[PDB]
Amino acid sequence: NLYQLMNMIQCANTRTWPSYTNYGCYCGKGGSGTPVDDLDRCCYTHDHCYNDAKNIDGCNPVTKTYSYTCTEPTITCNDSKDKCARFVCDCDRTAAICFAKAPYNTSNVMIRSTNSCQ
């Protein structure tokens, strides 16, 4: 779920939401070019995770609601029986964690369509 994903990001980092809404070549809707740094690489993978998720019947990562738990900054996926809920939760979980780990370069904030993401 796009909103739950927001919270995993909230639950695992210091950096706010708009902080990722549009950063580098892949953080944000769709992606082009080659990832910029490793934070953008987090977004690249997330993306791909979402594409694979779509390979599950009736599975829309973007709107699927799963069961997860947060205890700043640890987050857990409680889905077992719903294959889509779990695949998507791990997708989002892995991203949040990936984000908290990566450095935040302020010069990559809006290089979109600017030519490096061909």
Ligand X SMILES: CCCCCCCCCCCCC(=O)O
| Of the candidate residues 11, 25, 43, 77, the single one contacting ligand X (CB under 6 A) | 43
CB 39 within 8 A of CB 105: yes
Scanning 17-25, 55-63, 78-86, 102-110 for contacts with ligand X by CB under 6 A, the matching segment is 17-25
Residues in 47-66 that interact with Na ion by CB under 5 A = 47
Asked if residues 22 and 112 have their Cβ atoms less than 8 Å apart, the reply is yes
Nearest-10 Cα torsion for 98, 39, 14, 3: -70
Q: Is 29 in the site for ligand X (CB under 6 A)?
A: yes
Q: CA 106, 114, 100: angle at the middle one, nearest 5?
A: 30
Choose the catalytic residue: 46, 52, 57, 79: 46
Query: By Cβ distance, which residue is nearest to Na ion?
Result: 31
Binding-site ranges for ligand X (CB under 6 A)? 17, 20-21, 27-29, 43, 46
